[PDB]
Design a binder for this molecule. Structure first.
Ligand SMILES: Nc1ncnc2c1ncn2[C@@H]1O[C@H](CO)[C@@H](O)[C@H]1O
Ligand SMILES: Nc1ncnc2c1ncn2[C@@H]1O[C@H](CO)[C@@H](O)[C@H]1O
Ligand SMILES: [Br-]
Ligand SMILES: [K+]
Ligand SMILES: [K+]
Lengths: 330, 330
């Protein structure tokens, strides 16, 4: 009996969401489909140009934890907010979903991280993130008992941007593996991969990470190739299990020489791709920690991801457990 | 030419929105379909029981102002927030829509008003509102030049709950009428009417209010009758123009002995009724200040209301002017 199926660790962020036309991205030099890091001044400037918006709790790993809880798994989260209204919102939403969240704010400045996410007509999302209080996440925020009691500890590639978060993750890896648990990461973003390519490969090759999540763009970036088949062969050689998503083309799960291809679900419309990779990870890890086959893990992931992209906001507002039952997956 | 078509005045509120089951309202003694006023302690309690939520700028008059601007009219707004993150969200969203909004916060405490809005499976909304900084709105917040330069000044019945807002409205009425402008009010909520019945009737009978908006429930409450036909006859006798909404049954506009019935638009599915009345007022007032017939004002009102109820959140995220053009209302 273990307390948690999945612990996730990431940048605790509230999303500020608006729809824009494609010229808006060009005029403001926002890299489309990417996570664009911004300072406080740029955040104010961008906000001043943004239309009326919606707010929703975000953070890649936060979304993944919420998804696992939604499906019926037991989840926990480490991430740092400020003692402010945005932080109170973040804390409420993740705990309300049934995720264990106990990371204490350190003060009111820097303020809670926020990401201005612009959704274009094609449903693509372009994020503009001020890290704020996320820069204060460190080893002191590792709840050692929680890591020890979680089947899988999953973390964001994005954690390599703030200065001390990587130290916390190294502590997590040691505790997890001392207790026979598994470590997982997502490559997060192709530009994130570009920034930390050598470090990410070292995490995988040293065995600090057991299960890796990537999309097509991240996998291509990791090996700096345009050959997707090369990327798949290389990622399989670098980690024990790789789960590679391919948008409308579904996903492929690799283990050694094993490959399991899974189809994307049928969708009404792509409203907002925000959270797709996050929720794929939720589905996958839920299945993984329930002892499901790798293909069925992929199927659960594709289900969760296809659901999230048909709504505004990064965390499904409907029951994923009910959808899984109806899809005949649980 | 006047600077503004519509000035609105109301409680500046950020909405915190979640879906709930029918049992949740009963268990928490929340009056369904109503605005339930709550103190700080109850706000904390209710939030602790609320699921993961979405935040969006609200406030009945705020929504109406935003709707006028969306349609292409020139709008302004008076309402008091705190110097906090919620207040900064509110200020951003209304100004981003192109509404003139210059009410300065008086400090961080009390904090910005928020309303926990619970949406049931039928799409009905039940609001639970902590007024916070709204209690500070007073005569000092009247921008006299704006009232003087606005074709219509419209305000909430809800303004009778905070202590000094009514004094601001009486100042508005004097300035508006001295400058040959018109005053309008919404009855807001049937329990609000029950609280201020005598005062609302006096506003109308004294001629401080020229145009009144009501739904069926509010009209029935105003005259404490269950005879809707009596309520229509009475409201017509009490104000120069009455616009009375009847949910799926459309609307009726009254002027003296004239009655103009308008059909509601036919809906796929009612997602969330939040903002329906507010946006009916936006369409009506936009039409009115453009010199349109009372029937066409009612038509524009129903168009805007039908749009807002098919989305989560109180302010339409799509173009109302484009919708009106397609409808030949222009
Ligand atoms: N730098 C970042 N680190 C972690 N998550 C982020 C970052 N920027 C944006 N996000 C989150 O990514 C989510 C979608 O994958 C959004 O909900 C958003 O909050
Ligand atoms: N007491 C109140 N005064 C004014 N507006 C309110 C009040 N309570 C809730 N609202 C707003 O009513 C809107 C729906 O008509 C919501 O957007 C909500 O913000
Ligand atoms: Br704050
Ligand atoms: K989404
Ligand atoms: K709505």
């Amino acid at each position: 009996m273990t307390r948690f199926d999945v612990l996730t660790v990431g940048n605790a962020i509230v999303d500020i969401i608006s729809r824009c036309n494609d010229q808006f991205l060009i005029d403001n030099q926002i890299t489309k489909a990417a996570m664009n890091l911004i300072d406080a001044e740029r955040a104010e400037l961008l906000y001043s140009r943004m239309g009326p918006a919606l707010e929703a709790s975000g953070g890649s790993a936060g979304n993944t934890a919420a998804g696992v809880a939604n499906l019926g798994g037991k989840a926990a989260y480490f991430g740092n907010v400020a003692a402010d209204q945005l932080g109170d919102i973040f804390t409420h939403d993740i705990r309300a979903q049934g995720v264990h969240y106990q990371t204490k704010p350190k003060g009111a400045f820097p303020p809670t991280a926020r990401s201005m996410i612009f959704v274009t007509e094609d449903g693509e999302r372009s994020m503009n993130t001020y890290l704020g209080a996320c820069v204060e996440l460190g080893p002191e925020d590792v709840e050692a008992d929680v890591v020890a009691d979680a089947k899988v500890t999953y973390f964001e590639g994005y954690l390599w941007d703030p200065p001390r978060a990587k130290e916390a993750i190294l502590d997590c890896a040691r505790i997890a593996h001392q207790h026979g648990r598994e470590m997982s990461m997502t490559l997060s973003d192709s530009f994130c991969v570009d920034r930390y390519r050598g470090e990410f490969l070292d995490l995988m090759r040293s065995g600090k990470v057991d299960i890796v999540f990537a999309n097509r763009q991240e996998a291509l970036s990791l090996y700096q190739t345009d050959d997707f088949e090369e990327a798949l062969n290389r990622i399989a050689a670098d980690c024990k299990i790789a789960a590679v998503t391919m948008s409308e083309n579904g996903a492929v799960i690799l283990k050694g020489r094993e490959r399991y291809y899974v189809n994307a679900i049928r969708i009404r419309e792509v409203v907002d791709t925000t959270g797709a990779g996050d929720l794929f990870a939720s589905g996958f890890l839920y299945g993984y920690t329930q002892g499901r086959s790798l293909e069925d893990c992929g199927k659960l992931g594709c289900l969760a991801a296809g659901i999230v992209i048909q709504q505004i906001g990064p965390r499904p507002m409907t029951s994923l457990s009910e959808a899984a039952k109806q899809a005949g997956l649980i």
